[PDB]
């Protein structure tokens, strides 16, 4: 063995144990387009990789070569497919292969193939016992790594590992209440365990989220979560929610509270509420406050909403033309 970054690393063309193999150059054609001017190390590894792949040489030395190829371009799915062929043909120890992949993910965690490979190992071994702790380490260095959170959702759902995840969620919201991946993970855990149709869980979740909004009123994730868990039943199906938000208006205001009020109004109008025209006017006023002053970046949106609301909820909207 010889690591790709070792100071005593030697090119493959200089290795006596590789002298029987002719390297295969890349078939780039007579006048290449988008030709990459590879480093010596890179072109050397892939010239010998092309050779073992062309032979379909299922040898120990080939298995070691794919390690070097993967480190030079860990997005080369072809090299990863061959490594999985060799893993099964050579009957390689898959826990030794897990020690390898925990290391490679540590050094390049923002990559599709490393995480997929880890998932294949876990399915082969049928062993999730290291996953939640390893993922927790990757997340301790990037609490928003998309592949990490995707992998964590797979392990939890496929091995029914729900027991302690809401507690893990709570720990990371403590650390960064703006971590939108954690709010999403919080919705994943509840959606699959108790669901939000349990009235106690939903209440607990709304109380919790409001407490968070009260603390960081400009944090957009708490607002999006609150809308997400209530919008499915219909924001107007919760009569108390409107007055409670208006009670935050003076000392916890944001464009996110203004916009939520327009969202409540929109649904109240869609459900034939009392004081229809009064509600329509309150909504139209907030749309223009948001479009002109509070949330101007979204002026085309709030203006469109104001036109939608007028289009179908004005007193004239149901009235015939001849009238």
């Amino acid at each position: 063995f010889l690591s790709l970054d070792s100071p005593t690393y030697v090119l493959y063309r200089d290795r006596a144990e590789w002298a029987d193999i002719d390297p295969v150059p890349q078939n780039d054609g007579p006048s290449p387009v988008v030709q990459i001017i590879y480093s010596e190390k890179f072109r050397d590894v892939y010239d010998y990789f092309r050779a073992v792949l062309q032979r379909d040489e299922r040898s120990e030395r080939a298995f070691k070569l794919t390690r070097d190829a993967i480190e030079l371009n860990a997005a080369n799915y072809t090299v990863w497919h061959f490594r999985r062929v060799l893993l099964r043909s050579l009957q390689k120890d898959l826990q030794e292969e897990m020690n390898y992949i925990i290391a490679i993910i540590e050094e390049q965690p923002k990559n599709y193939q490393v995480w997929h490979h880890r998932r294949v190992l876990v399915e082969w071994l049928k062993d999730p016992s290291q996953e939640l702790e390893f993922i927790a380490d990757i997340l301790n260095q990037d609490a928003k790594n998309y592949h990490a959170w995707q992998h964590r959702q797979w392990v939890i759902q496929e091995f029914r590992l729900w027991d302690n995840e809401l507690q893990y969620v709570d720990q990371l919201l403590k650390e960064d209440v703006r971590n939108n991946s954690v709010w999403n993970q919080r919705h994943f855990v509840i959606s699959n365990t108790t669901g939000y149709s349990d009235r106690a869980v939903l209440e607990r979740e709304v109380q919790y989220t409001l407490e968070m909004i009260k603390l960081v009123p400009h944090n957009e994730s708490a607002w999006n979560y609150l809308k997400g868990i209530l919008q499915d039943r219909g924001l107007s199906r919760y009569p108390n929610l409107l007055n409670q938000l208006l009670d935050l208006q003076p000392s916890h205001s944001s464009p996110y509270l203004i916009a939520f009020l327009v969202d409540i109004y929109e649904d109240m109008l869609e459900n034939q509420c009392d004081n229809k025209e009064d509600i329509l006017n309150k909504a139209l006023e907030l749309c223009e406050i948001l479009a002109k002053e509070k949330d101007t970046i979204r002026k085309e949106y709030w203006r469109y909403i104001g036109r939608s609301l007028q289009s179908k909820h004005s007193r004239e909207s149901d009235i015939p033309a001849s009238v």
Partner: protein, 407 residues
């Protein structure tokens, strides 16, 4: 008036759009503030130097950068050695947007190269000798339609390409990216794009695909990579563009999606984030803002009467301001945000978004908005395939005069 500032990012009111951290510092807010601090230096730079702002797209500089990369790349692109049709598509599409002709000698060399990337069993690989993969397959078919010559179209093995697609199709309606690979909403978009351009869609190819994509829309209104994952701009563009191809956009809750994407525009910086409470990035000028013409077309297809007939439903001005002032590298090429280095990926999608923001069209109603000097105007791009609209028409009309494989 004369005290009036035409640049949105430079008005006095604009200071009010800076981050409010509520005196609760977390990593998200610190990282957000650091960007706003760096962007503000960009916006204030004219005032502090006592110059009048000019917003100029450095066409000649980007052309030189693109023209050379189409031929040769430094070893910095070793990380993309399995994505070389992507480099073809990004560079060819940037040149197209910049209204730069593709020499017939370059066109044919590209044809010969993607031919070498094509697998005997359908699909294209990231380079010659590599196994096929839906992502370099989508890029190769796009690059081949951008060239759009008779030679380019004939590179595609349509019979085998359909065989490849079927071999990745999953029972729940999803696709694999490649044999032994992962499943996420990118494969659905990749498969439908190539299959519709080349006319190889069969009555059962995408059975249950629209239904699988719709399960990827989460509580945010955007779309995650697989069901249950956080909404993201790249996956959301993939998910909604795929359904438009399949004529199934109504499977989604389009209202909660419209609300989601418009909130991904940054009130201060003017560009888009990829997901809530992350950082602005010039490439989401396409992945996020491209979602608005798709939404416009869908709601107009349902007779929504409130749709604007002159603007997309985002701040077109602000986005052109961010791309022109913040994402241009003075040596050519565009980039993520100030302080990052250039690359052909951001070059492709910064210019793709710039073009989206410049050009509104819904039927006969056309209305352009070109910030800065008028030469900044780019060629239009098609918001489903992100190749020039003319190229989509030309390709589909060509391939519709073939039979669907197996009849």
């Amino acid at each position: 008036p004369v005290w009036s500032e035409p640049l949105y990012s430079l008005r006095p009111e604009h200071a009010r759009e800076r981050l409010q951290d509520d005196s609760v510092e977390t990593v998200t807010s610190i990282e957000q503030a650091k960007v706003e601090e760096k962007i503000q230096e960009v916006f204030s730079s004219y005032k502090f130097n006592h110059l009048v702002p000019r917003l100029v797209l450095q066409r000649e500089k980007h052309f030189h950068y693109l023209k050379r990369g189409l031929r040769q790349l430094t070893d910095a692109y070793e990380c993309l050695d399995a994505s070389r049709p992507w480099l073809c598509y990004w560079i060819l599409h940037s040149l197209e947007l910049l209204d730069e002709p593709i020499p017939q000698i370059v066109a044919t060399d590209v044809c010969q190269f993607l031919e070498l990337c094509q697998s005997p069993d359908g699909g294209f690989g990231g380079g010659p000798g590599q196994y096929p993969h839906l992502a370099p397959t989508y890029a190769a078919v796009n690059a081949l339609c951008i060239i759009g010559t008779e030679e380019a179209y004939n590179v595609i093995n349509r019979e085998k390409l359909l065989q490849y697609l079927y071999s990745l199709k999953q029972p729940d309606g999803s696709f694999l990216m490649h044999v032994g690979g992962e499943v996420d909403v990118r494969s659905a978009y990749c498969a439908a794009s190539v299959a519709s351009l080349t006319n190889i869609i069969t009555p059962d190819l995408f059975e249950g695909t629209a239904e699988w994509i719709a399960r990827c829309q989460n509580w945010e209104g955007g779309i995650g990579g697989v069901p249950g994952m956080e909404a993201h701009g790249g996956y959301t563009f993939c998910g909604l563009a795929a359904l438009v191809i399949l004529k199934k956009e109504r499977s989604l809750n389009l209202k909660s999606l419209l609300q989601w994407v418009t909130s991904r525009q940054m009130r201060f910086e003017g560009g888009f984030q990829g997901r809530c409470n992350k950082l602005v990035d010039g490439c989401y000028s396409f992945w996020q803002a491209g979602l608005l013409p798709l939404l416009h077309r869908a709601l107009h297809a349902q007779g929504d009467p409130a749709l604007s007939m002159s603007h997309w439903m985002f701040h077109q001005q602000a986005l052109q301001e961010y791309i022109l002032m913040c994402c241009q590298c003075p040596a050519g090429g565009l980039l993520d945000k100030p302080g990052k280095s250039r690359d052909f990926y951001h070059t492709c999608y910064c210019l793709s978004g710039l073009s989206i923001a410049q050009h509104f069209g819904s039927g006969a109603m056309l209305h352009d908005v070109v910030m800065g000097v008028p030469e900044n105007v780019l060629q239009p791009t098609h918001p489903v395939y992100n190749i020039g609209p003319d190229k989509v028409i030309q390709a589909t009309t060509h391939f519709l005069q073939k039979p669907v494989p197996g009849f």
